[PDB]
Ligand binder design. Structure first.
Ligand code: CA
Ligand code: NA
Length: 255
């Protein structure tokens, strides 16, 4: 099976690159599931996120360049970025502005800010982080249906809220409220419209198509806790960052 389904298994972490400074103890790395010319499914981006003025986005045309640590281009964001929640989708980096609830769409090839929007009511900067902290209040996500944001609000009393985002202008299209305390999980990601969390196990699922939540006990092996765990719907794999290590996981879905 190569299409959508429920997550039933996660493999062992594979380390693709280890960061060589403590600035990269935590970070985000990713590929675009809907690559826009001139990028391809091999293009990789990396951001080392320790510090207070994070602006450099490393871009690698080839996986070989990413694995040897030699960027083909460095983008300098026009404003500082917060935490590890950013994603790339359809040619744009979507990231959170430092010390804000603002999500910014930055078109990578043209180096152009295309949109900026507050996520209504979202906590930020240490209000509803994932368990380990890192100011991980706001976590963007891509699945087979496009762009989402994972956050919480005072209205939700710290439970995970997720919203589908319009990728062009960042407007919220639809919002769901779960019963999972965001501060109680290590990270979260969306696969085939279901939110999954990692405690280690994949321990909760919330299906946006039905509104039904499930407890799970799928083993999740950490290379060494993850500061970032995202899903790539083109590869159908998890991408993670664990103590300097940029890691990927095979998964199995069952329809
Ligand atoms: Ca995530
Ligand atoms: Na994310």
């Amino acid at each position: 099976d190569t299409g959508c389904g429920e997550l039933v298994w996660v493999g062992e972490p594979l380390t693709l690159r280890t960061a060589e400074t403590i600035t990269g103890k935590y970070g985000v790395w990713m590929r675009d599931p809907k690559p826009t010319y001139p990028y391809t499914q091999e293009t990789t981006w990396r951001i080392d996120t320790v510090g207070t003025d994070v602006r450099q986005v490393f871009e690698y045309d080839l996986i070989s360049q990413f694995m040897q640590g030699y960027p083909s281009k460095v983008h300098i964001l026009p404003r500082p970025l917060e935490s590890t929640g950013a994603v790339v989708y359809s040619g744009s980096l979507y990231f959170q502005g430092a010390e804000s609830r603002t999500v910014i769409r930055y078109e990578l090839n043209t180096e152009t800010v295309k949109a900026e929007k507050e996520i209504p009511g979202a906590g930020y900067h240490g209000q509803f982080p994932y368990s380990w902290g890192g100011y991980t209040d706001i976590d963007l996500a891509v699945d087979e249906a496009g762009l989402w944001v994972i956050y919480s609000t005072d209205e939700a009393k710290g439970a995970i809220v997720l919203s589908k985002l319009n990728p062009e202008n960042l407007e919220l299209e639809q919002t769901w409220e779960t019963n999972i305390r965001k501060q109680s999980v290590t990270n979260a990601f969306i696969i085939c419209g279901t939110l999954y969390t990692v405690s280690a196990t994949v321990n909760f699922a919330y299906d946006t198509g039905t509104g039904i939540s499930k407890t799970l006990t799928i083993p999740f092996k950490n290379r060494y806790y993850s500061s970032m765990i995202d899903y790539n719907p083109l590869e159908k794999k998890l991408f993670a960052w664990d103590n300097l290590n940029m890691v990927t996981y095979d998964i199995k879905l069952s329809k």
